[PDB]
Scaffold this active site. Sequence first.
Site, short mmCIF file in Angstrom:
data_model
loop_
_atom_site.label_atom_id
_atom_site.label_comp_id
_atom_site.label_asym_id
_atom_site.label_seq_id
_atom_site.Cartn_x
_atom_site.Cartn_y
_atom_site.Cartn_z
N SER A 134 -11.32 -20.53 -6.05
CA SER A 134 -9.95 -20.40 -5.52
C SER A 134 -9.96 -20.73 -4.07
O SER A 134 -9.05 -21.35 -3.58
CB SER A 134 -9.31 -19.03 -5.62
N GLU A 187 0.77 -1.23 0.00
CA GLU A 187 0.00 0.00 0.00
C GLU A 187 0.81 1.28 0.00
O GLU A 187 0.31 2.29 -0.48
CB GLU A 187 -0.95 0.04 1.18
N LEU A 211 -9.14 3.54 2.72
CA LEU A 211 -10.08 4.21 1.84
C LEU A 211 -10.89 5.29 2.57
O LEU A 211 -11.43 5.01 3.63
CB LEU A 211 -11.04 3.18 1.22
N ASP A 225 -6.42 6.42 -5.03
CA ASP A 225 -5.89 5.07 -5.21
C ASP A 225 -5.94 4.59 -6.68
O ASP A 225 -6.32 5.31 -7.59
CB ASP A 225 -6.57 4.09 -4.26
N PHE A 270 -8.04 -7.03 3.08
CA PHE A 270 -7.79 -5.60 3.27
C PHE A 270 -8.04 -4.76 1.98
O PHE A 270 -8.63 -3.70 1.96
CB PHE A 270 -6.28 -5.48 3.64
N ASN A 322 -6.05 -20.19 -10.88
CA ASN A 322 -7.39 -19.69 -10.78
C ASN A 322 -7.48 -18.24 -10.25
O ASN A 322 -8.26 -17.37 -10.71
CB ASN A 322 -8.19 -20.63 -9.91
#
Length: 162
Positions: free
Chosen positions: A117, A11, A32, A20, A104, A132
Amino acid sequence: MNPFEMLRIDEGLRLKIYKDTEGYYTIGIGHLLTKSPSLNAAKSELDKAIGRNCNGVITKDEAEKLFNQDVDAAVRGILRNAKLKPVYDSLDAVRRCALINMVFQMGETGVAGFTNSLRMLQQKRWDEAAVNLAKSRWYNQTPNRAKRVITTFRTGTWDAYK
Ligand SMILES: [Cl-]
Ligand SMILES: [Cl-]
């Protein structure tokens, strides 16, 4: 390596509000603020998150704090989610970091969506799960980062992070 260092790498850290990869208002370590186009709606959200008039700027300490809240929340929603929990519980310590990372970034709901998955990870079919996971908007939109997390699920080591 740990979930915090991992996310800190992915990040980065920014002290002024920024947009972002999806063009959304964010600040600090991937926190966010709002999905709204409004710079003002973001600055408001900021202030209510922090408890002061920030004027769109925060301190290292303050980013670290929201971060600590955000990790805890990611973990607490994995644990609370019927689809996510059994996977997390089945995984080893390194691979757990990778599911935290996806949660996250995309939220619990988003990740629970990766039904196939998830089943392959639970079944410990590493190679399969990695192929996948790669067939996703996620992979196509932030390929360097998905590759990092994917390799993490694949090998069960921190190699992609060193
Ligand atoms: Cl695809
Ligand atoms: Cl990327």
